[PDB]
Structure 1
Amino acid sequence: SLSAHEIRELFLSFFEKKGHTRVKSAPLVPENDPTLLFVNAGMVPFKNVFLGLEKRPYKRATSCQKCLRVSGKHNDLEQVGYTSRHHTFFEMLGNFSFGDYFKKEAIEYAWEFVTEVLKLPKEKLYVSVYKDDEEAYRIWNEHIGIPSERIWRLGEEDNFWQMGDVGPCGPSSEIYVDRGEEYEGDERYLEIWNLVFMQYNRDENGVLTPLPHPNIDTGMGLERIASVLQGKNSNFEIDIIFPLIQFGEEVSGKKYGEKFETDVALRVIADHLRAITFAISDGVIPSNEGRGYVIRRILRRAMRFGYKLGIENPFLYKGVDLVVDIMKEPYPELELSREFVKGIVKGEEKRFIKTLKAGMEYIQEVIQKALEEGRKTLSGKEVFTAYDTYGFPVDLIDEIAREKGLGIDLEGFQCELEEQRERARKPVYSHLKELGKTSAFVGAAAL
């Protein structure tokens, strides 16, 4: 019913209709936060304002934020392709108070938007609050008029938010849509909005004291809500994503929705195309460490799944064109970076494709021999070969082996690394013993 592009502008213009200043998406890469690789949510750009370190001409903000979930405590990379809900890159709609309005308004606005602007039947909406948050329950039940039967009081894991282990925190309220009895669990009661009531400060001892000025933080995933409004069962079948699945079909000659493993590769390519396009446009260069390596991995993973579909040549650079053309309205700057991003991608593909094929042969070889001889893991040496000789990211090796039931000898791989680190001994820096763990985020040459 509503195009993804349409949903975005509405959200923005609706909150703009209420004192909110439309702040544009901060780049995926944090200008000054060398600890965090990518912006993973809404408030990150606004973090200091929520703390009182940065002032702002406004007390109300709204935005559609370019987000990546490929690092640290918010890392969905391992799941991308296997489900219908996970992303590397995605857009988050948010409304924030610093701290002007609190729970009531945040709830009032959110209810209005979902009922009036989104036009979703109110009897098909469920809400969750923190069991100890009586104020929030009250607002929903009495003031908004949600029957007690469509309100959930849940615990800390479900309804309490924290900025970190210390600092600003508070209860949260999530809005769900009952998609029908034809579904199950969180797929039936699909969350579309998370409202955060930044109410408390947690000190170094874990004690919670009230904040002088309560804050508001919210997040609504654009791809997910669009799937509800477009009646889709997957984020990948939406107007602004499905064309990329079709790009995968056209190049491979395989069809979506026939074989599960075929769809996985298709979803991986479609999603990764958006990630690489947006990251390289925002200034990231594929390298062997940090932000550059995460995208190298993403790009390599996509190359691998395409080759799994029988694509013997580079194709990912062609997909950039589609993404740019699909996302040029809300992000007109993607057009200035188009050819630049395309060239970078093609060069990366061209640089690694032959080494990927040769590596896949080696990996499938030792994998096959291990099954013939009754081995349940790839030895440390074999993992080091594919990682060092063929430049395969560890996570990728672990995933290819996982396809046939084999794990990877982690202690043996750690051992092998010290022995290699030793060849120089007898950029990036690793504690000894960290090396096994550090190798999941850097290329072999970086060690």
Structure 2
Amino acid sequence: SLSAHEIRELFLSFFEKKGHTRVKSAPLVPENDPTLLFVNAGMVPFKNVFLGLEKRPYKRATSCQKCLRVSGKHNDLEQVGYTSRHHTFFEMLGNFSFGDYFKKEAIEYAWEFVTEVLKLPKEKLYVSVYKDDEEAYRIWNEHIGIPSERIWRLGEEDNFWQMGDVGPCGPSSEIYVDRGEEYEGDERYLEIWNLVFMQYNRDENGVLTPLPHPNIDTGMGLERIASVLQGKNSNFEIDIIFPLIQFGEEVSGKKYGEKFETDVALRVIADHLRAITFAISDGVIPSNEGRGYVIRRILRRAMRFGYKLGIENPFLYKGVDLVVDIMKEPYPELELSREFVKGIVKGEEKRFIKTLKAGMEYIQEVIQKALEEGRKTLSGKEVFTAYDTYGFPVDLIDEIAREKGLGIDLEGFQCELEEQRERARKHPVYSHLKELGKTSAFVGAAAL
């Protein structure tokens, strides 16, 4: 079955056996990239090394990178809790080639690891390739020996990766595990490894041209593969995550696996505990803008859901100790920041907990009132009150109102935001007018 931790060392040691230099995970916070809030994939820190802007004593690297998909084009936050596969924080195993080996080697190593190391049966494995990538197809079908019936030729939306609107890109090949006739769609053929074949460079006119030195970029989500080997049907039930669910159960006195809504809260708490512990350890301080407001919302979202389960006192700070104890092996640095992080979280919860309760009462009040008078949305003045007066993040206001089938007057809120900005011009963070509505979803009222 292999524990999560074992799958990590196996993956890292396996590639070292292939001349790959084990590179320590880069911190979640990008050293010099103010446009990207958090690292979202293994290749991020190696970006310039893939572009030739940097160099390294090695041509082959591997690593288990700390990732967060809570911003930009890779924002999964809104879904965390509702599904069994979405996370804010997660670990991505990866092997990279900087102008070295390519498709052939990338596939051989992958197939070897999956079949020999993880011991996954070859008969229950499927692979996808870009329809126009005859090269990849051949390697799988002939070289590796995968029967045609287990190879899928899909389109650009399925098997083509790009570094950006412009720049290096290329076809990709994903490895799926057929979990059995009991599951459906992507739950039955759970993708576990994405092999990106950086083969081209897209110019400003969309024209593709080969790269003088094609690169390799792979990413295997740790929790995901662990759920497979561990025989679980949810990433949250794996060895390094289920203990956090149990924690939620103990604090709230509720049981996991009895009510979807109850599970939502428990998952959110478990996921969010990991995000805040890792983010904060890596130097993120809760604030009303940028990276700090991302952790603030996440941390505030767990509070709300925790409160929804009946927890009346701060509790997240206790979960930090569990995250550190579970992950100290792979990330020993966590023990040296344990108390620091615990103190940050406990301070945050004690700062907003009463406001949260008072605000939840107000919010449910207007909501109830709204659906009693036939209204289908929360007005701009109401969305503004919860946001300004109770400090509730706009996304949290929307999620709460959604549970009752109510939306939010984005336009009214927009204007309501301008009137306030005017109250500062008639009676940090910058934003054009008519943008206050979009900016407010990423900053605290005070920031504006």
Distance in 1 (CA, whole Å) between partners of 2:31 and 2:72 is 18
* Structure 1 residue 236, shift from structure 2 partner: 0.2
* Structure 1 residue 392, shift from structure 2 partner: 0.1
Distance in 2 (CA, whole Å) between partners of 1:336 and 1:259 is 38
1:299-336 deviation digits (Å, cap 9, x = unpaired): 00000000000000000000000000000000000000
Structure 1 residue matching 2:38: 3-state secondary structure: coil
Structure 1 residue matching 2:220: 3-state secondary structure: strand
Distance in 2 (CA, whole Å) between partners of 1:67 and 1:257 is 27
* Structure 1 residue 90, shift from structure 2 partner: 0.1
Q: How does 1:46-195 map to 2 (within 5 A)?
A: 46-195=46-195
Structure 2 residue matching 1:48: 3-state secondary structure: helix
Distance in 2 (CA, whole Å) between partners of 1:127 and 1:18 is 22
* Structure 1 residue 256, shift from structure 2 partner: 0.1
Q: What is the root-mean-square deviation in Å for CA atoms of aligned residues?
A: 0.3
* Structure 1 residue 123, shift from structure 2 partner: 0.3
1:338-395 deviation digits (Å, cap 9, x = unpaired): 0000000000000000000000000000000000000000000000000000000000
1:275-318 deviation digits (Å, cap 9, x = unpaired): 00000000000000000000000000000000000000000000
* Structure 1 residue 16, shift from structure 2 partner: 0.3
Corresponding residue for residue 430 of structure 2: 429
Structure 2 residue matching 1:87: 3-state secondary structure: coil
1:233-283 deviation digits (Å, cap 9, x = unpaired): 000000000000000000000000000000000000000000000000000
**What are the ranges of 5 or more consecutive residues in structure 2 without an aligned counterpart?**
none
Q: Does 1:314 align with 2:314?
A: yes
Distance in 2 (CA, whole Å) between partners of 1:265 and 1:240 is 18
* Structure 1 residue 51, shift from structure 2 partner: 0.3
Structure 1 residue matching 2:49: 3-state secondary structure: coil
Distance in 1 (CA, whole Å) between partners of 2:281 and 2:131 is 44
Distance in 1 (CA, whole Å) between partners of 2:62 and 2:31 is 20
Distance in 2 (CA, whole Å) between partners of 1:236 and 1:284 is 25
Distance in 2 (CA, whole Å) between partners of 1:253 and 1:136 is 52
* Structure 1 residue 180, shift from structure 2 partner: 0.3
Corresponding residue for residue 347 of structure 2: 347
Distance in 2 (CA, whole Å) between partners of 1:99 and 1:134 is 21
Query: How many residues of Structure 1 are paired with residues of Structure 2 in the alignment?
Result: 447
Distance in 2 (CA, whole Å) between partners of 1:176 and 1:43 is 21
* Structure 1 residue 99, shift from structure 2 partner: 1.3
1:50-70 deviation digits (Å, cap 9, x = unpaired): 001101110000000000000
What's the % identity of the aligned pairs?
100
1:381-425 deviation digits (Å, cap 9, x = unpaired): 000000000000000000000000000000000000000001111
Distance in 1 (CA, whole Å) between partners of 2:52 and 2:100 is 13
Task: Normalising by structure 1, report the TM-score.
Answer: 1.00
Structure 1 residue matching 2:129: 3-state secondary structure: strand
Corresponding residue for residue 303 of structure 1: 303
Structure 2 residue matching 1:44: 3-state secondary structure: coil
Corresponding residue for residue 445 of structure 2: 444
Distance in 1 (CA, whole Å) between partners of 2:116 and 2:425 is 67
1:78-132 deviation digits (Å, cap 9, x = unpaired): 0000000000000000000001000000000000000000000000000000000
